[PDB]
Amino acid sequence: SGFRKMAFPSGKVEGCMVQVTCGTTTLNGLWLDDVVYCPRHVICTSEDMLNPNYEDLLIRKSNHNFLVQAGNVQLRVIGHSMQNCVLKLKVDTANPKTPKYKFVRIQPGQTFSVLACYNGSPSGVYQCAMRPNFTIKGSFLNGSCGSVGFNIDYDCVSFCYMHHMELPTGVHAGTDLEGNFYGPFVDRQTAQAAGTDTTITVNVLAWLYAAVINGDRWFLNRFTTTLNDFNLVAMKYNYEPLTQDHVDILGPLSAQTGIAVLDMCASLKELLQNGMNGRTILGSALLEDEFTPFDVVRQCSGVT
Amino acid sequence: SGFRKMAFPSGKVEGCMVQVTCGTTTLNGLWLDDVVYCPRHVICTSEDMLNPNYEDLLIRKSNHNFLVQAGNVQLRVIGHSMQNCVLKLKVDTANPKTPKYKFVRIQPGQTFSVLACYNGSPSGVYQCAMRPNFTIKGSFLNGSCGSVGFNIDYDCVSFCYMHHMELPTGVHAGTDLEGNFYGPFVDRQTAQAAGTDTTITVNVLAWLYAAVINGDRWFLNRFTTTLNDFNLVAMKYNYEPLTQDHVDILGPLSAQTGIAVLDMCASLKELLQNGMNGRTILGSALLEDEFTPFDVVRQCSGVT
Ligand SMILES: O=C(Nc1cnccc1CO)[C@@H]1CCOc2ccc(Cl)cc21
Ligand SMILES: O=C(Nc1cnccc1CO)[C@@H]1CCOc2ccc(Cl)cc21
């Protein structure tokens, strides 16, 4: 009973957080096995961020210039290399708390938990979606760089995001764990356009199924629609077009509730065209798109 | 930049979760030092829950009937005692992962994180408020009993909630760590009235300050109000009456933003009387009350 914006338990990730300092800049690093991963802008001063030449800035740094600390644990740096927008600092000690892990590049519309950190210390955990325009609407202040996003499947942490930057608009941008930015962003202090964003249609439908399962069903109607007709409405309301692949991933929710995906689409169509009429769905007065069909199945069945 | 419903990092709590089995019932326990805490209804069968005589049911149980497990760790039970609605199982081994901790009884309107667990395994973490009627709107399924709520102040986990029951209405009830229920609830399968609930006024105002800090300011107006006038509006809209103690705890937010508390009350008054006019505040289309003034200060300053 009930449905919440739930994050993964952050324990396995807290054990990997370290503080990385280079010169006057301090940010967060991720210590997995004998490597510490952090945003490459740790080598910059505030002045360098206008148009940094990272290759040149990194050449002025030696292993002993990277100070890596995890509480009373001072790590000895024996190698450094830049891979895309991340620095990889080889340390002489493997992290005894390294969980089973993978590095994954998530798709837009997928969700993950963020463990927000400052000075290598965890401050909080929250669940979010990678927006269709490759930004995330997180909660990050100065010092949060290097905080990571992840998913967990039983004992395996799949790291998908490392925080790098706040855009002038207050939204966030970062990379996968190989240092490749999600979206068109560059690690420079320059105004950068984020694409037009859309609402994640498949996630809104998944959340409507979660609402029906938990008792909120006032939005169910006597109508149906087609993928074509629904997509004309989705275009009008800046929603992602629904594909048969999205219908297919909603199959378990459709099967559990007995509500055909196109019938749920007709409810979403009427909610888009008429609004919520001052009513709520799972404690929200807007259409929620930060729950994937898999999140709903996991939460509704109590997967640990 | 940004503002999220953030939970505490759950690492310190994950290390305390165990599975407790007695007969055919299995639920979650909390292992701190050499004691395991769990809901006393672990000693009941589904049939017993109608009107259980816990004193009699517990008399039929011996230390060897409580199976306590944490993965490949099987704990040896050397004592058992009931304290209010919790069972305390003394084990022969202190939990090596016991964090610095306290047991606290939170006040209604305060917030905390819940680490939802099944079979002793963490499934997710979410932030919530203790409602003014002493219920929580969580996300709990069968097997989640024994999952706990907590707050963290630097290295100290203050445990405030242990999950026991879902009311016929889909809301949740539980106890403090001494087994005293929050609210009028009893651990019986009987329909139980939860009081009339109200919206937590001080938290809504704190969240309006968080919105101003993060750039959402369309709701600021040219008006002011008095505690008396505001409270007539709060009564009409089923909001908790605002006191000088609530005004006092909003002082840091008032000081940071330069918006007098009564001026923010006038914005809240106009939002209550006119609605949000199809607009959002921090990604919400309703007035959010699950952030205390302390949560806003902590999040807005990046406390770890
Ligand atoms: O964005 C930044 N950080 C930041 C991150 N999350 C939240 C708040 C802040 C503090 O501004 C820094 C400072 C600004 O300039 C740039 C430019 C490029 C890159 Cl990669 C990083 C940065
Ligand atoms: O409420 C319960 N559990 C539960 C908890 N959270 C979410 C879902 C469920 C499963 O119903 C059990 C089963 C029902 O009867 C009672 C009566 C009293 C008490 Cl203390 C516990 C219970």
Report the DSSP beta bridge partners of residue A112: A128
Tokens of A88: 């990889």
Residue B20 CB-density burial (10 A; 0-12 exposed, 13-18 middle, 19+ buried):
buried
- Three-class DSSP category at B195: coil
A135 C-beta closer than 6 A to ligand 1: no
b or e along A264-292 (b: 16 or more beta carbons within 10 Å of the residue's beta carbon)?
bbbbbbbbbeeeeeeeebbbbbbbbbbbb
Q: How far apart are CA A188 and CA A57, in angstroms?
A: 14
Strands B156-166 and B100-103: parallel
Give the start-to-end residue ranges of the domains of chain B: 1-14+100-197, 15-99, 198-301
Decide which of 2.60.40.10, 3.10.20.600, 2.40.10.10, 3.40.50.2000 is the CATH code for B15-99.
Answer: 2.40.10.10
CA-CA-CA-CA dihedral for B48, B49, B52, B57, to nearest 10: 50
Question: Which technique was used to obtain these atomic coordinates?
Answer: X-ray
DSSP A23: T
Query: H/E element holding B296?
Result: helix B293-301
At which residue do the structure tokens 């905080």 appear?
A147
Which among A72, A123, A256, A271 is the top mutation candidate for probing chain B, defined by the most B β-carbons within 10 Å of its own β-carbon? A123
Q: How far apart are CA B1 and CA B255, in angstroms?
A: 19
Tokens of A56: 């040149």
Cβ-Cβ contacts under 8 Å, A170 against chain B? 1-2, 214-215
Q: How far apart are CA A1 and CA A280, in angstroms?
A: 17
Q: Give the up-direction half-sphere exposure of residue B85: CA atoms within 13 A in the CB hemisphere.
A: 24
B118 C-beta closer than 6 A to ligand 2: no
* CA A193 from centroid of its chain's CA atoms: 19
Measured in degrees and rounded to the nearest 5, phi and psi for residue A94 equal: -75, 140
> B168 in contact with A at a CB cutoff of 8 Å?
no
**Residue A178's CB: how many other CB atoms inside 10 A?**
14
Tokens of A282: 């799972």
Report the DSSP beta bridge partners of residue A165: A173
Q: Which of A28, A50, A135, A142 to mutate to test the pocket of ligand 1 (most atoms within 8 A of CB)?
A: A142
B290 and B127 Cβ atoms separated by less than 8 Å: yes
> B214 in contact with A at a CB cutoff of 8 Å?
yes
**Residue B293's CB: how many other CB atoms inside 10 A?**
22
| Strands ordered across the beta sheet of B35-39 | B73-75, B66-70, B17-22, B25-32, B35-39, B86-91, B77-83
At which residue do the structure tokens 């993060």 appear?
B214
B165 and B172 Cβ atoms separated by less than 8 Å: yes
Chain A segment 15-34 residues within 8 A of B by beta carbon are 15
| Strands ordered across the beta sheet of A17-22 | A73-75, A66-70, A17-22, A25-32, A35-39, A86-91, A77-83
Contact A124 B299 (CB under 8 A): yes
List all residues 6 or more positions away from B47 whose beta carbon is below 8 Å from its beta carbon.
none
B263 C-beta closer than 6 A to ligand 2: no
Tokens of A153: 């499947």
Measured in degrees and rounded to the nearest 5, phi and psi for residue A32 equal: -130, 125
Q: DSSP string covering B221-255, please?
A: -S----HHHHHHHHHHTTBPPP-HHHHHHTHHHHH
B118 and B144 Cβ atoms separated by less than 8 Å: yes
**Residue A116's CB: how many other CB atoms inside 10 A?**
28
Q: How far apart are CA B141 and CA A105, in angstroms?
A: 32
Strands B35-39 and B25-32: antiparallel
Looking at domain A1-14+100-197, its CATH superfamily turns out to be: Trypsin-like serine proteases (2.40.10.10)
Q: Give the up-direction half-sphere exposure of residue B20: CA atoms within 13 A in the CB hemisphere.
A: 31
CA-CA-CA-CA dihedral for B127, B211, A271, A172, to nearest 10: -80
Tell me the resolution in Å. 1.7
CA-CA-CA-CA dihedral for A277, A281, A285, A287, to nearest 10: -100
Contact A126 B4 (CB under 8 A): yes
Contact A170 B214 (CB under 8 A): yes
Which of A10, A138, A172 has the CB atom closest to B10's CB atom?
A10
Topology (CATH level 3) of domain B198-301: main proteinase (3clpro) structure, domain 3 (1.10.1840)
Cβ-Cβ contacts under 8 Å, A282 against chain B? none
**Residue A60's CB: how many other CB atoms inside 10 A?**
9
Nearest listed ligand to the Cα of residue B162: 2
B247 and B227 Cβ atoms separated by less than 8 Å: yes
* CA A60 from centroid of its chain's CA atoms: 33
Nearest listed ligand to the Cα of residue A145: 1
Nearest-Cα distance to chain A for B3, in Å, is 5
**Residue B90's CB: how many other CB atoms inside 10 A?**
16
Q: Residues A278, B166, A209, CA angle at the centre, nearest 5°?
A: 50
Which of A6, A14, A141 has the CB atom closest to B302's CB atom?
A141
Q: How far apart are CA A39 and CA A29, in angstroms?
A: 8
Q: How far apart are CA B120 and CA A236, in angstroms?
A: 47
Cβ-Cβ contacts under 8 Å, A151 against chain B? none
Q: From the alpha carbon of A186, which atom of ligand 1 is closest?
A: 20
Q: Report chain B's terminal Cα–Cα distance, integer Å.
A: 16
Domains A1-14+100-197 and A15-99 share a fold: yes
DSSP B179: S
Residue B245 CB-density burial (10 A; 0-12 exposed, 13-18 middle, 19+ buried):
exposed
> B172 in contact with A at a CB cutoff of 8 Å?
yes
SS3 sequence of B91-152: ECCCCCCCCEEEECCCCCCCEEEEEEEECCEEEEEEEEECCCCCCECCCCCCCCCCCEEEEE
List all residues 6 or more positions away from B24 whose beta carbon is below 8 Å from its beta carbon.
B45
Tokens of B225: 């109000």
A39 and B42 Cβ atoms separated by less than 8 Å: no
Chain B segment 123-142 residues within 8 A of A by beta carbon are 123-126, 128, 137-142
